[PDB]
Amino acid sequence: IDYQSETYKDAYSRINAIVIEGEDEAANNYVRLAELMPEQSEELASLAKMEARHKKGFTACGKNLNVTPDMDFAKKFFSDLHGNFQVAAAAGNIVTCLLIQALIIEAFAISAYNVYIPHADDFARKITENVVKDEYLHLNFGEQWLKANFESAKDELERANRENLAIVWRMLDEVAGDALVLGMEKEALMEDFTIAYQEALQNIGFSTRETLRMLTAGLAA
Numbered sequence: 001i002d003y004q005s006e007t008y009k010d011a012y013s014r015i016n017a018i019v020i021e022g023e024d025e026a027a028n029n030y031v032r033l034a035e036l037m038p039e040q041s042e043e044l045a046s047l048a049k050m051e052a053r054h055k056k057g058f059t060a061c062g063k064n065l066n067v068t069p070d071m072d073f074a075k076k077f078f079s080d081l082h083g084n085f086q087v088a089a090a091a092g093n094i095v096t097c098l099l100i101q102a103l104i105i106e107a108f109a110i111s112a113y114n115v116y117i118p119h120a121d122d123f124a125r126k127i128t129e130n131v132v133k134d135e136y137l138h139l140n141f142g143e144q145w146l147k148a149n150f151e152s153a154k155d156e157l158e159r160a161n162r163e164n165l166a167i168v169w170r171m172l173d174e175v176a177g178d179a180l181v182l183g184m185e186k187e188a189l190m191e192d193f194t195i196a197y198q199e200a201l202q203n204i205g206f207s208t209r210e211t212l213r214m215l216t217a218g219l220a221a
């Protein structure tokens with residue numbers, strides 16, 4: 001990997017932006033959730049501070065490589081998912097909101113960061129390994145809530161899944177090519193995501209059988 005060829009910097013500027021916008025949208029989303037579940041607003045506000053901290057770390061990984069992040073691509077990358085969260089939030093569909101942010105985006109984020117790490121430069125390797133440390137040193141707030149609320153949330157979780165997984169698989173298809181310039185094999189991303197997300201869904205209470213039915217519902221569309 002030439003960390004400064006135009007190929008690379010070009011790929012990095014979208015990927016860095018995706019990560020930066022990703023953390024920004026998490027921060028706002030967890031703040032917004034703090035409103036919808038004021039019972040748990042203390043944890044959620046702490047989660048949001050944390051995401052906002054990672055925003056700064058990932059901002060520095062661009063600058064170190066002399067890359068301006070392409071924020072408009074990243075904002076347009078997130079757009080449908082952001083939409084479904086907004087709509088689901090605007091109507092108090094907290095179950096849907098939590099699937100999106102606490103399970104889906106999170107599996108995807110963690111898997112990506114983990115697949116990036118072996119192939120990242122020294123500075124960004126450090127920053128990402130810390131983000132990962134933190135982003136699973138604190139516990140998956142949204143997952144424990146969905147597990148404790150499972151019987152009630154079960155049917156909405158299935159609807160949320162079909163609508164939202166579908167999109168996240170569209171999202172990986174669009175940056176596969178860019179991720180590969182960063183040394184990230186599309187397959188490794190798919191596996192890690194699928195494992196994390198499958199095991200999050202089983203943990204909150206679906207059978208294996210049910211999880212598979214759910215993951216397949218994502219493929220198409």
Ligand SMILES: CCCCCCCCCCCCCCCCCC=O
Binds near residue numbers: 015016026062108112
């Ligand atoms: C410094 C650049 C780090 C590169 C990581 C590779 C990212 C691959 C593309 C998909 C990433 C989706 C990130 C979403 C992060 C926001 C959610 C955080 O909890």
